[PDB]
Amino acid sequence: AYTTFSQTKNDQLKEPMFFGQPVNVARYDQQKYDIFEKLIEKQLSFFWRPEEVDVSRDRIDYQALPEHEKHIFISNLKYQTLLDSIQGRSPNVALLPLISIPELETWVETWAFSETIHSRSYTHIIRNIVNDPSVVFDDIVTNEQIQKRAEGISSYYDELIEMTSYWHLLGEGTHTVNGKTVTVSLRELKKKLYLCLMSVNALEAIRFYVSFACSFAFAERELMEGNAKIIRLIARDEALHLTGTQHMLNLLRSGADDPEMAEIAEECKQECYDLFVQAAQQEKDWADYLFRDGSMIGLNKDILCQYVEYITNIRMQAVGLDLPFQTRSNPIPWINTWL
Amino acid sequence: AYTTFSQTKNDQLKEPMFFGQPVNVARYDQQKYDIFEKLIEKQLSFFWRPEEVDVSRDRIDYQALPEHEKHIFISNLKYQTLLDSIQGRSPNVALLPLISIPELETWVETWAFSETIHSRSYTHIIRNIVNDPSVVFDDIVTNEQIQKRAEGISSYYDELIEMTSYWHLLGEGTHTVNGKTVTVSLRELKKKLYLCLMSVNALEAIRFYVSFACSFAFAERELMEGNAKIIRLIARDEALHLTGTQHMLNLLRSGADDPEMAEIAEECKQECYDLFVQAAQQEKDWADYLFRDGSMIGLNKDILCQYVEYITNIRMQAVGLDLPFQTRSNPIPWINTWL
Ligand SMILES: [Fe+3]
Ligand SMILES: [Fe+3]
Ligand SMILES: [Fe+3]
Ligand SMILES: [Fe+3]
């Protein structure tokens, strides 16, 4: 029942963000929510290409790094490339079929596109610092630690796409699939969406910000400066991306957009809190892997775990969740100059 | 069975364009088909924003147009906005779930994104020349003539998405859906893809080029020059877009990518020819609507129909179809300076 051009002339100003009539005409003279129009415009204004950044000195730095410092740098880079491999495609495959207002439709496609630039920038970095990029790229899919995070993150998107496919084909109700019982509930699909957005918000607002700290710690030592300039550009995009999911999550939560979402968001409250806590703990456990073979000037397991708690508290509050950790000051204030 | 990060470490250089393992890692150090990497790079190099173009004189021109010339201009603009409303979303929703090589995945997301810029540029034009843009935007969905083309074009995408949803959930075979028979065939889904790409190629390579002729005919009269500058930028993107579908269609046809596609493409040959002929006839009938109330200097029903035949022959040949019309010279050679 999904359609790439819905024939009904609907008032797009009254549609909900999600699960309404698929957007027919893409117009930009008006918005229900102008934050999405402001995010499009800002992301457009930021357009950059990786090749605009000189990464030619980073091979020298990378080779001069002690082996455990190479391990810190490349593990971090591998994790970023994993995450924006998912982010390049997943907003488009998972969110587009559900969007019912043009400004959010176009924001999501602009968001995903900006992720492909990030993915291309990671390739630009990798091929300029290692001799065999395939070894790096292949380790991303087979790395025991990396593959752990990939599973959980992608499952939020996959479960949403699968249930979407059932809902578009069958609609709500209980159905027969080769003698199996399939209960299709829009309330449940709305739950899958809200949890997915919560997971995506933790991804961009916490998981990538932990990784930014690792990259900029090298830059603080005047090393891997080409990488650091690219990460500055990525982080500036990332701030737009998390603002997007913050607004989607809060507009759903308030009931201003879908009153059914407000009560779903309350039912999901503990499960949202738990998923944020788990992601923060997973990033703490990732720090044990990053520093498995030793630490470096300005960054170690303890410092980075403090930063996880610091940033997690900020992000959870902004989407209305209680704080899981003691309130603390920024343990790495030097990171602010890069952001 | 669709996954946003497939866990198997596969050789992406050996995957097919479509229906293979979904792309896990987005890497750009290598390509199976470097045309898609070249298209990404070129489209990135072309990045433009509508607001970079001064459209401030076009309101004066538009108001000075006789009523039938306003009708020609705005009907053409309405049709373009319809078509790139579909093109902004549909490559992402319809093609992304099926792509199994990273360079094609990223090309498709870059292609769709560049379409949203076109859609935003049409909004930029509309709001600068009419007093009530809503009347324009609403007529796009309700216009009897426009809605006719929207139905057929969107059906190629919708049928492909629906069958995709059955294939990811159920896989190949015959299944029970509430006591109904559903035969899911990958060969059939491959047929839906190939016909869709043929339809999309006619869309961008013929239907939009007919509309470019209308826009540039005004520019030839030194009218609507702001519009014309935007259409120049759009047409330059369009040439990349049709090159993309040309290569997908030809690589599938050759069997170089999927040997099963080569025999499917032969079985589909007459039906591909017929769909191109129908689109050309539909564009000829659209010219009767554009010039319903009279013609203008340099462009009329007869001239535009000659251009339909001229351009249709070129596009059909490039994707290996026989020519439906007598071979003729460019009836509007002035269009070349704008392209
Ligand atoms: Fe990113
Ligand atoms: Fe992001
Ligand atoms: Fe376009
Ligand atoms: Fe196009």
Numbering used by the authors:
A (entry chain A), B (entry chain A): 1 to 339
List sentences quoted exactly from the publication behind this structure.
Here, we present a novel polymer-based support and an associated deposition method, with the aim of providing ultralow-background conditions for serial data collection. The supports themselves consist of a thin 2–3 µm thick cyclic olefin co­polymer (COC) membrane perforated with a dense array of 2–3 µm sized holes and suspended on a rigid frame. To assess the quality of structures that can be obtained from chip-mounted crystals, diffraction data were collected from a range of proteins. These proteins included the insulin, thaumatin and HEWL that were used in initial tests, and also TD1, a tubulin–DARPin D1 complex, EcR2a, a class Ia ribo­nucleotide reductase radical-generating subunit, rhodopsin–miniGo and PepTst, a bacterial peptide transporter.
